[PDB]
Ligand binder design. Sequence first.
Ligand SMILES: C=C[C@@]1(F)CN(C2CCCC2)c2nc(Nc3ccc(C(=O)NN4CCN(C)CC4)cc3OC)ncc2N(C)C1=O
Ligand SMILES: [Zn+2]
Length: 293
Amino acid sequence: KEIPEVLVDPRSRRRYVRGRFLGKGGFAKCFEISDADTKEVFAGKIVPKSLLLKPHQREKMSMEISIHRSLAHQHVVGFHGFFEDNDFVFVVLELCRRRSLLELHKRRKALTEPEARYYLRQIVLGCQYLHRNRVIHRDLKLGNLFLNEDLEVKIGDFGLATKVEYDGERKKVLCGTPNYIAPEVLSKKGHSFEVDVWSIGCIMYTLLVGKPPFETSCLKETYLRIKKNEYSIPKHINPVAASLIQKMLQTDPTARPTINELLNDEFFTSGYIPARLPITCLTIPPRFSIAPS
Ligand SMILES: C=C[C@@]1(F)CN(C2CCCC2)c2nc(Nc3ccc(C(=O)NN4CCN(C)CC4)cc3OC)ncc2N(C)C1=O
Ligand SMILES: [Zn+2]
């Protein structure tokens, strides 16, 4: 059951030449795809219906599209359309040519504090937007924070995202395995937006420390630690940073900052936030000199 060389959308009359394989995110296989008219290049997410035999699995795809199609923001992955044939579902997404913060972290490990500020601010801005529109992402991790050509963060993968339908709603269920799973999810006693503030907490730790907050050999031993709040921040981490991590990584959901509180935190306001990063920042730690030589 092989994927077409050209992807034709009969409704919009659009044709996409299937370009080079990018990798296999989940059930989906991802390719650079180019529109035949505009020549505009996109990221195609192609999932075979043979893996969507069950309504439950079909419904998760549908919801992902439902949620992601309704979003437009600078730090959210552009959703440009979807369509299907008898064998596949095709989703046309914003190509993010510098991959994700995961690939950056693999190369650089711990970032400089300004780099963290730069990225975390964009992670927070997109996540503020989701929350404003009642969307919880629920799997914010380095692999889901994509980078465009200018190293701007674009929040992607809405396969666990859920829409809050009514004020004060606690989601009882999360069908999936998020990377930075909040303790209220692991305890299985309800959760809302504060789940995303947890993950951002873990992302900040990881960006600054160079490894995740609760990491172990065993995945269940890690879950043990998240419940128990078993983690510690190295001494070389600056107090203002370490304070904000501690605020975000509280077992109590109600005790964490809201998404609209974060950028007013001392970490952002009393520290240097680059306007932009150079592409060398993918490879080499930037020093942020005041002038060249
Ligand atoms: C459908 C898009 C996708 F679903 C998935 N991702 C990634 C996650 C893993 C699969 C693609 C996106 N990626 C990309 N771009 C790229 C991913 C991987 C490689 C790249 O260099 N790939 N290499 C990996 C090593 N291989 C041996 C060669 C290909 C190169 C990329 O851009 C040129 N843009 C957007 C997305 N988004 C937002 C999505 O939602
Ligand atoms: Zn399920």
